[PDB]
């Protein structure tokens, strides 16, 4: 439908992005991409219910000039098909901090050294209900 | 240095789009555009404080394949520079309904006969802080 795509965000370091959406009742995977543009992502947030060999695994990665970086996987999966889920992402020069629905937080390195986030895109089995920018 | 631009909005008839943003302190006016894309707007929402010869007047218009239609001016002006303002928009095949910060709501004809709104863009005087779909 695909997913909501926002540009010109100009999200600066220290600012938080709140994204709330509905996880499809038959969700297999959904994505929230953040970065400079579609080919340069400081954060590819990919909760995989069942995809690419991952079962209930949050996979994160960066994308530099179209090239996927080294994947990072989390130890929790507070997402359930057919339920609303909210994620809070804070941008910082060194790392991005992600706060999951249940309060679990983890960081992902700002490998691309972005000084601001101007691009956000949603895709997969996640229907965005609201997005808050600072 | 324009404002936030969102695409693939997929807003359907009856769904309520709530947009909250900060009006620049030195804003002479601000704009929130809704439509299919930058050249096809079902709604050019333009509150003018002091711009284009108008004072404290909300000017609305449509843009079809690039052509601006006949403007319609609203009866109220519940806006102020340097403050947070939220507007709620919904639509059907005939009209768009815009609800203002003061609870006042008016209709603007759906001249593009849109059955879905996929594009939204704010200018440099309206910093979007949150967008909700309900
Ligand atoms: O890295 C994010 C990226 O992963 C792709 O899938 C990977 C898979 O995660 C990995 O374990 C395997 O070895 O290679 C696959 C191909 O690169 C996803 O397909 C892509 O959409 C992103 O999610
Ligand atoms: O119609 C939307 C369009 O208006 C342009 O300005 C008009 C102004 O609204 C009208 O009252 C005056 O007579 O002529 C101006 C120029 O044709 C804005 O410049 C444009 O950005 C839109 O807001």
3D architecture notes:
- The complex is a heterodimer of chains A (134) and B (134).
- Chain A is mostly beta strands and 134 residues long.
- Chain A has one domain (1-134): Jelly Rolls, CATH 2.60.120.
- Chain A has strands spanning 5-11, 16-23, 30-37, 40-51, 54-64, 67-68, 72-73, 84-91, 95-99, 105-109, 117-124, 126-133.
- Chain B contains no helices and 12 strands.
- Chain A binds chain B through residues 1-9, 128-134, and chain B through 2-10, 128-134.
- β12 (126-133) of chain A pairs antiparallel with β12 (126-133) of chain B.
- A molecule of 2 linked components (BGC-GAL) is lined by residues 44, 46, 52, 59, 61, 68, 71 of chain B.
- The PDB classes it as sugar binding protein.
- Keywords: lectin, carbohydrate-binding proteins, galactosides, galectin, sugar binding protein.
- The assembly is dimeric.
- The entry is titled "X-RAY crystal structure of C2S human galectin-1 complexed with lactose".
**Would you give the CATH topology of chain B?**
Jelly Rolls
Largest interface chains and counts:
A-B, 16 and 16 residues
Bound molecules: a molecule of 2 linked components (BGC-GAL)
Spatial gap, N to C terminus of chain A: 26 Å
Rg of chain B, alpha carbons: 13 Å
Beta fraction of chain A: over 45%
SSE order of chain B, as H and E? EEEEEEEEEEEE
Characterize the biggest β-sheet of chain B: 7 strands, antiparallel
How much helicity do the residues of chain B have?
A: under 10%
General shape of chain B: globular
Structural class of chain A: mainly beta
Q: Total strand count of chain A, please?
A: 12
Helices and strands of chain A, in N-to-C order?
EEEEEEEEEEEE
Shape of chain A: globular
Main location (chains A, B): secreted
Modified residues (N-acetylalanine) (chains A, B): 1
Modified residues (Phosphoserine) (chains A, B): 29
Modified residues (N6-succinyllysine) (chains A, B): 107
């Amino acid at each position: 439908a695909s997913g909501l795509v926002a540009s010109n965000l100009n999200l600066k370091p220290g600012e938080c992005l709140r994204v709330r959406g509905e996880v499809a009742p038959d969700a297999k995977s959904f994505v929230l991409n953040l970065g400079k543009d579609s080919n340069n992502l400081c954060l590819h947030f990919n909760p995989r219910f069942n995809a690419h060999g991952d079962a209930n695994t949050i996979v994160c990665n960066s994308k530099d000039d179209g090239a996927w970086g080294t994947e990072q996987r989390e130890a929790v999966f507070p997402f359930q098909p057919g339920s609303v889920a909210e994620v809070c992402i804070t941008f910082d020069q060194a790392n991005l901090t992600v706060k999951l629905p249940d309060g679990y937080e983890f960081k992902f390195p700002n490998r691309l050294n972005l000084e601001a986030i101007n691009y956000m895109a949603a895709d997969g089995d996640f229907k965005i209900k609201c997005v808050a920018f600072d």
